[PDB]
Design a protein around this ligand. Structure first.
Ligand SMILES: CCCCCCCCCCCCCCCCCC(=O)OC[C@H](COP(=O)([O-])OCC(O)COP(=O)([O-])OC[C@@H](COC(=O)CCCCCCCCCCCCCCCCC)OC(=O)CCCCCCCCCCCCCCCCC)OC(=O)CCCCCCCCCCCCCCCCC
Ligand SMILES: CCCCCCCCCCCCCCCCCC(=O)OC[C@H](COP(=O)([O-])OCC(O)COP(=O)([O-])OC[C@@H](COC(=O)CCCCCCCCCCCCCCCCC)OC(=O)CCCCCCCCCCCCCCCCC)OC(=O)CCCCCCCCCCCCCCCCC
Ligand SMILES: CCCCCCCCCCCCCCCCCC(=O)OC[C@H](COP(=O)([O-])OCC(O)COP(=O)([O-])OC[C@@H](COC(=O)CCCCCCCCCCCCCCCCC)OC(=O)CCCCCCCCCCCCCCCCC)OC(=O)CCCCCCCCCCCCCCCCC
Ligand SMILES: COC1=C(OC)C(=O)C(C/C=C(/C)CC/C=C(\C)CC/C=C(\C)CC/C=C(\C)CC/C=C(\C)CC/C=C(\C)CC/C=C(/C)CC/C=C(\C)CC/C=C(\C)CCC=C(C)C)=C(C)C1=O
Ligand SMILES: CCCCCCCCCCCCCCCC(=O)OC[C@H](COP(=O)([O-])OCC[N+](C)(C)C)OC(=O)CCCCCCCCCCCCCCC
Ligand SMILES: CCCCCCCCCCCCCCCC(=O)OC[C@H](COP(=O)([O-])OCC[N+](C)(C)C)OC(=O)CCCCCCCCCCCCCCC
Ligand SMILES: CCCCCCCCCCCCCCCC(=O)OC[C@H](COP(=O)(O)OCCN)OC(=O)CCCCCCCCCCCCCCC
Ligand code: HEC
Ligand code: HEM
Ligand code: HEM
Lengths: 86, 387, 245, 57, 122, 60, 87
């Protein structure tokens, strides 16, 4: 109608631009039949434990930053004293 | 054909808010854009309301603000909400930029969106300064005097630009009038650039944490992602209401409740907290022109990212070196902010210089090297598996 | 820099306004207002608190009107120009003790007594710093000296403040009969100054509680509804039948 | 009431069911039929649609 | 432009390969895409002409298997879980099913990248 | 009876749904006002102006 | 793209939504070969004369009547509040 646009990667429903699919079966259930908050605490606890175990060290070693903060603050306070100017 | 797909305006609404394919596994870090839009709307409304009681002049701005505080009906809510929302804006902006940086969203085909976002960030930073310089307290006066003097670093027409911006020879009535006039206009330009941001993004869709194509599985935005954003909205509301009703002057320094005395220089001349790291970068270099050049580059370097990532993978989900170095850079950023906030003492100068060196090294040396190393290691291990 | 030029750190206290649900102790507010009027209004100025700001907080309408009728103000031109005087009203600010900054500087050596309307919020420390400043006038230590007109106070930045010890024992006689000492009067006047800084504390703290409660309930309900609606996606089953040619 | 329809019908435009009217007017689908399969203590009640106008399902 | 991995340079010296093999094994274990069952070649970007052409020159069974793998990975990522320790991608199945086709397409494109620049030396 | 009547009355048409929402909001505002007023009044015991009037006013 | 837009009456180039045309030959020249300011004065004068003689009274009548009542109203209002008008 309007014009033929450029080359994109989304299209719309039907022609989404994906590859040809074959032999895929998908099931589900109505939201009014499933019980919400079922298998929540167990799954959440297990996932949190796994995430803490695996990506923990990538963040923990905020480790030297706090130490350099503390050392810098302490040394700066010490140098601004009576015995620091000797 | 239904009405929503036939009428022009309803079709415009539907194509962006109701029916729009999205990746089906985007995490909770994809909601910050809606929070940014809500905060911007709140700021626009609150500023429009506040402009009805403010007189932009040297000898009447502070008294007008005080009259707003203690005489206008529910004026404390207005002022506290404006200030606290302006503070939360930069927190959400930093989180948005962090999300865009961690998952490698600057790569094609979303470079134009990245550039538009960078421009919006610069405009927001400029808008924040004029907004905070209006009350004409001690820190506003002295920080404006210091910052607007940086325009003298340009070769030729050096102090002429400063005089033109000041509208005189010092911070007085005309510069407050100029700042009040400009602070009203910039948010509308920001909104227009946000519309451009969204229309540029919509042509290709959002990414996903995995980093692979999401064309195989998609769900419409209307029932699912319009209810996943409500939790974030309510959480942000509960965060901002506590500040507005129990600690309104939270991020606010003690020197911000006094009249602007042009004879008593305060002990420390610092800007608001969200602009501290750039101030530290500026103060790190002993030279003057190099200081402003580095301060500009610290924000302009985000445009060089797409041509600096030599990685076959798109993101840091499956990049062991990237996960480490990203948090290292975040810690360095926090250290830079802390150093910029405090006094320019003996050891702090060395710490700030080292932090600035690391900040400018991370974008220019570390990224290509570790991307190349990861690619090489993975390729070698895969090649040496059959024999 | 050096702590001598930075001032000793203030002392932490506990006040009724610090609690999450508590507001202001109004008897202390009235005592502090009396102390300010009878000991402070000679040199400092509070030209941001009107007479009508006090009715309902520390005084009633009749008491406030009677108190305000004593002072005198200028009341514009009349007939053939001229500048006359009138008795005070219920909508006038507290009378400043000095006309301009120059007269204030001339009277008190060369120092300008700062305005006290927003001095609690404009100092690093809050109520604690002011209270520790008022009750911190000690004899100078060994090796230090004080020039004429300069007093020693460690809490003041630089340990030299040009304000002679303002409060002394039994300076005021409180209406309720509280034994007026330096510490009690200092605490009461600090409370009154803090009220003068932010006079809307009670209402703000009152509405904040209800807002927080409503927001918490809404947040919990929103989380539950999000958990409910997203079920047909988080609980899918995908089976791959291999497409044998 | 719901009725059946098919594009090869001789009198397809003139059928007196609103669904047939809309589908024929907009060429939405090829055909559709209604069924009320019943059992001893249960049953089904629905429709069966066949189409090739992909994108307007 | 494009990834510039230099494994070919390293493989010339057997000393470096023998020294670096355990580090590469540890790095590939640490990257952790096998926990989702994906192959390494499913993570490369497909948004240019070369990759979009290469994906059209794959055998049908390979394309269907890739579609299933990506769908399963997305479904796993929706609910924040990983495959059990028995269904992880074994090293035997982690081969290069996309590199040769992309290399052929790039070679064809590079072939043309010369006739236009042709000059006459006289 | 049971839970069918509740659906039939309130959550059957959109109009009844909205009317119930608005009436419930109108009453919930008053309920929360009363609750917060009671909580605030019990929070401040002996440190309000109306409470401390008989310690200053009467002895004029 | 797609998005299955609505129904309009304009379209675009190539498919303008008009009836099928047949046997309509059209000739035109180049702007660099033709001559501007050629026959402008004559044609413009004839068109203006024809338009004035054709539309004419359509505008002439209402404006004239309005001006007449304007003048009469001004004159009468000036007269009435004078000395002799009130009597
Ligand atoms: C700055 C730093 C943060 C920036 C941004 C980071 C993320 C953004 C935060 C958004 C929060 C979203 C969220 O988790 O809430 C929705 C989340 C629902 O998410 P979902 O659809 O299940 O999928 C996401 C999973 O959480 C995903 O599950 P998982 O498998 O990945 O496991 C993670 C699990 C971890 O679970 C556990 O390990 C806990 C296990 C027991 C749960 C205890 C109940 C918690 C409530 O997550 C939780 O359960 C956390 C929920 C607690 C919400 C916290 C709300 C405020 C925090 C937001 C940021 C805080 C910063 C401010 C700091 C304040 C001071 C400075 O809500 C719930 O957890 C359900 C609550 C049910 C309410 C019951 C009452 C109903 C009455 C009728
Ligand atoms: C029971 C005990 C405690 C439970 C109470 C928790 C209740 C409330 C917390 C909510 C929560 O955890 O669940 C919501 C949330 C729901 O899950 P989801 O959003 O669906 O899952 C996201 C991905 O699947 C997650 O993917 P992933 O785990 O595979 O990936 C790692 C993940 C993060 O995970 C980690 O590696 C860290 C988490 C480790 C946990 C603690 C380890 C400590 C040892 O990556 C990110 O999401 C990073 C975000 C990228 C950028 C955002 C931040 C950057 C800041 C910007 C800096 C400045 C900008 C510079 C640019 C400007 C220059 C001009 O759970 C999480 O995502 C948890 C991860 C941490 C985010 C929330 C952090 C808030 C505080 C929690 C601390 C944890 C202890
Ligand atoms: C309150 C508002 C009330 C009215 C609102 C609507 C009025 C619209 C605005 C009119 C402006 C456009 C217009 O008519 O003139 C453009 C008009 C071009 O339009 P066009 O394509 O000929 O179509 C209009 C025709 O008049 C086609 O119409 P026609 O064939 O029925 O002829 C009617 C003819 C009327 O016939 C005549 O007056 C007889 C010819 C004598 C020419 C009078 C002026 C010369 O009109 C004219 O040719 C008028 C010429 C100039 C108009 C004066 C503008 C005043 C604006 C009024 C306000 O300009 C000229 O024809 C100018 C000719 C000479 C210019 C070139 C000079 C040589 C190079 C300079 C070198 C020096 C260095
Ligand atoms: C698929 O992926 C994507 C998603 O992600 C996954 C998405 O999420 C989204 C979808 C969601 C978004 C993020 C999109 C939204 C974001 C934007 C488009 C950003 C742009 C934001 C704006 C343009 C802000 C606009 C705000 C405005 C205009 C503020 C103005 C407010 C008012 C006019 C009303 C308030 C009243 C005020 C301030 C005046 C004071 C109040 C009074 C009562 C006094 C005034 C009274 C009068 C003057 C009386 C006379 C009035 C008259 C007659 C005039 C009319 C009335 C007026 C007041 C004008 C998209 C698109 C997507 O791609
Ligand atoms: C005050 C702020 C909110 C003010 C109110 C804000 C909400 C305003 C209405 C919501 C937004 C407008 C509706 C948008 C969707 C729509 O168009 O619905 C119209 C439907 C028919 O739409 P359809 O499903 O596409 O079927 C027609 C398809 N044909 C046959 C044409 C091919 O036809 C219908 O059945 C309903 C038609 C009603 C049209 C809107 C009327 C305006 C609202 C009247 C007031 C309602 C009461 C309000 C009480 C609060
Ligand atoms: C400019 C006018 C504003 C706009 C003011 C009017 C617009 C309200 C904003 C939210 C709009 C949400 C639209 C959701 C679609 C919808 O309208 O469906 C109605 C739903 C229930 O829909 P349902 O889940 O499908 O169940 C109905 C079952 N039937 C009856 C059909 C058999 O029922 C609901 O959605 C109830 C939602 C809450 C309605 C109470 C009013 C609260 C919003 C007004 C006050 C807050 C305003 C916030 C503004 C930022
Ligand atoms: C801060 C203020 C925010 C608004 C305040 C809360 C509004 C009311 C929320 C309470 C009721 C929610 C409806 C329950 C679900 C329902 O009933 O309908 C379900 C509909 C989907 O329709 P469906 O057909 O699939 O439903 C199934 C069959 N009927 O989901 C919704 O509509 C979600 C409503 C949330 C409103 C939008 C929130 C997100 C805002 C994004 C901001 C984007 C930028 C904006 C820039 C200005
Ligand atoms: C005894 C009469 C009296 C005089 C004279 C007086 N004040 Fe002050 N005074 C203050 C506060 C608070 C400051 C601010 C100190 C600072 O800025 O560090 C101050 C500071 C001053 C200063 C400025 C000192 C400087 O170095 O700038 C002067 C001058 C001064 N007071 C004069 C509270 C009081 C209070 C308590 C209500 C009373 C009573 C009081 N003052 C009574 C008096
Ligand atoms: C992104 C948008 C905006 C941002 C980031 C912003 C930021 C700020 C900030 C930080 C202040 C300082 C307040 C303080 O220090 O107490 C301020 C003040 C002010 N702003 Fe905005 N603002 C925005 C939009 C607007 C708009 C749209 C208007 C007018 C329509 C406006 C009008 C004002 C006024 C009048 C003041 C002075 C009032 C006061 O300081 O209390 N602002 N702004
Ligand atoms: C008012 C300011 C802004 C608004 C309203 C806005 C709006 C949005 C929204 C709603 C999204 C979708 C959520 C998401 O994908 O994360 C988005 C995505 C994005 N934004 Fe912003 N944004 C703003 C600021 C910025 C800034 C400052 C940057 C960069 C410096 C930026 C860069 C991006 C990028 C790259 C994406 C795509 C992320 C992806 O597709 O994975 N935006 N924008």
């Amino acid at each position: 109608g309007g014009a033929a646009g450029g080359k994109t990667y989304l299209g719309w429903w039907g022609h989404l631009g994906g590859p040809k699919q074959k032999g895929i079966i998908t099931y589900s259930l109505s939201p009014f039949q499933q019980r919400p908050m079922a298998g929540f605490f167990k799954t959440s606890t297990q996932n949190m434990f796994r995430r803490v175990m695996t990506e923990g060290l990538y963040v923990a070693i905020f480790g030297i930053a706090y130490y350099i903060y503390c050392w810098g603050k302490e040394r700066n306070e010490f140098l601004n004293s009576k015995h620091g100017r000797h | 054909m239904k009405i929503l797909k036939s009428n022009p305006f309803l079709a415009l609404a539907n194509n962006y808010m109701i029916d729009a394919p999205e990746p089906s596994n985007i995490s909770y870090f994809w909601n910050f854009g809606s929070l940014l839009a809500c905060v911007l709307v709140i700021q626009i409304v609150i500023g429009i309301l506040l402009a009805c009681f403010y007189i932009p002049n040297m000898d009447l701005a502070f008294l007008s603000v005080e009259r707003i505080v203690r005489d206008v009906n529910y004026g404390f809510l207005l002022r506290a909400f404006h200030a606290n929302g302006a503070s939360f804006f930069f927190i959400f902006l930093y989180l948005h930029i962090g999300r865009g940086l961690y998952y490698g969203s600057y790569k094609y085909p979303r470079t134009m969106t990245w550039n538009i976002g960078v421009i919006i960030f610069l405009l927001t930073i400029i808008t924040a300064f004029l907004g905070y310089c209006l009350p004409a307290n001690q820190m506003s006066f002295w920080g404006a005097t210091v910052i607007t003097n940086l325009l003298s670093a340009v070769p030729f027409i050096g102090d002429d630009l400063v005089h033109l911006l000041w509208g005189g020879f010092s911070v007085s009535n005309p510069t407050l009038n100029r700042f009040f006039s400009l602070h009203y206009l910039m948010p509308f330009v920001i909104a227009a650039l946000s519309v451009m941001h969204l229309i540029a993004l919509h042509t290709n869709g959002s990414s996903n944490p995995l980093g692979v194509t999401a064309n195989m599985d998609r769900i419409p935005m209307n029932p699912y992602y319009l209810i996943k954003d409500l939790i974030t909205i309510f959480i942000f509301l509960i965060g901002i209401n506590y500040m507005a009703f129990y600690n309104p002057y939270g991020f606010m320094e003690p020197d911000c409740a006094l009249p602007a005395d042009p004879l008593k220089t305060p002990m420390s001349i610092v800007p608001e907290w969200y602009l501290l790291p750039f101030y530290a970068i500026l103060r790190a270099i002993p030279n003057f022109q190099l200081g402003v050049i580095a301060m500009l580059l610290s924000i302009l370097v985000l445009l060089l990212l797409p041509l600096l990532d030599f990685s076959a993978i798109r993101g840091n989900s499956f990049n062991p070196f990237g996960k480490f170095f990203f948090w290292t850079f975040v810690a360095d950023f926090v250290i830079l902010a802390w150093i910029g906030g405090s006094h320019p003492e003996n050891v702090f100068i060395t710490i700030g210089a080292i932090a600035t060196i690391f900040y400018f090294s991370y974008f220019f040396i570390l990224i290509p090297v570790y991307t190349i190393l990861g690619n090489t290691l993975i390729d070698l291990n895969l090649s040496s598996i059959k024999r | 820099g050096t702590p001598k030029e930075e001032g000793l750190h203030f002392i932490q206290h506990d006040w009724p306004q610090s609690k999450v649900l508590s507001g202001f102790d109004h008897a202390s507010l009235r005592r502090g207002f009396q102390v300010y009027r009878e000991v402070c209004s000679a040199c400092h100025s509070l030209n941001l608190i009107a007479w009508r700001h006090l009715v309902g907080v520390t005084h009633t309408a009749d008491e406030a009107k009677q108190m305000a009728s004593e002072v005198e103000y200028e009341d514009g031109p009349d007939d053939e120009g001229n500048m006359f005087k009138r008795p005070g009203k219920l909508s006038d600010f507290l009378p400043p003790p000095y006309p301009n900054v120059e007269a204030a500087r001339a009277s008190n050596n060369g120092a300008a007594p700062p305005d006290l309307s927003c001095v609690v919020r404009g100092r690093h420390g809050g109520q604690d710093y002011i209270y520790s400043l008022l009750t911190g006038y000690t004899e100078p230590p060994a090796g230090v000296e004080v020039p004429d007109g300069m007093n020693f106070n460690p809490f003041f930045p630089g340990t030299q403040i040009a304000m002679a010890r303002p409060l002394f024992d039994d300076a005021v006689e409180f209406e309720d009969g509280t034994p007026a000492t330096t510490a009690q009067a200092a605490k009461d006047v600090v409370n009154f100054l803090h009220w003068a800084s932010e006079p809307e504390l009670d209402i703000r703290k009152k509405m904040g509680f209800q807002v927080i409660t409503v927001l918490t309930i809404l947040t919990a309900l929103s989380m539950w509804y999000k958990r409910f609606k997203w079920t047909p996606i988080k609980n899918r089953k995908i089976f791959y039948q291999r497409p044998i040619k | 009431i719901i009725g059946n329809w098919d594009r090869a019908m001789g009198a397809s435009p003139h059928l007196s069911s609103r669904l047939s009217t809309i589908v024929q007017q907009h060429q939405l689908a090829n055909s559709f039929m209604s069924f009320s399969t019943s059992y001893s203590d249960t049953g089904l009640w629905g429709i069966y649609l066949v189409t090739e106008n992909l994108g307007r399902i | 432009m494009k990834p510039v991995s230099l494994a070919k340079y390293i493989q010339k010296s057997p000393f470096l390969t023998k020294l670096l093999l355990p580090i590469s094994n540890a790095y590939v274990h640490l990257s952790g895409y096998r926990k989702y069952g994906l192959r390494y070649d499913d993570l490369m970007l497909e948004e240019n002409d070369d990759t979009q052409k290469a994906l059209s020159r794959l055998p049908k069974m390979e394309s269907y298997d890739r579609v299933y793998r990506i769908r399963r990975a997305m479904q796993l990522s929706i609910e924040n879980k990983i495959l059990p320790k028995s269904e992880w991608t074994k090293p035997e199945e982690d081969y290069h099913y996309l590199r040769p086709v992309l290399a052929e397409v790039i070679a064809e494109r590079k072939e043309r990248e010369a006739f236009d620049a042709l000059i006459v030396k006289k | 009876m049971a839970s069918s009547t509740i659906y039939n009355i309130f959550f059957r048409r959109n109009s009844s749904f909205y009317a119930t929402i608005f009436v419930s909001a109108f009453f919930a505002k008053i309920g929360f006002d009363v609750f917060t007023d009671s909580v605030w009044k019990r929070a401040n015991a002996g440190l309000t102006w109306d409470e401390v009037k008989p310690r200053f006013l009467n002895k004029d």
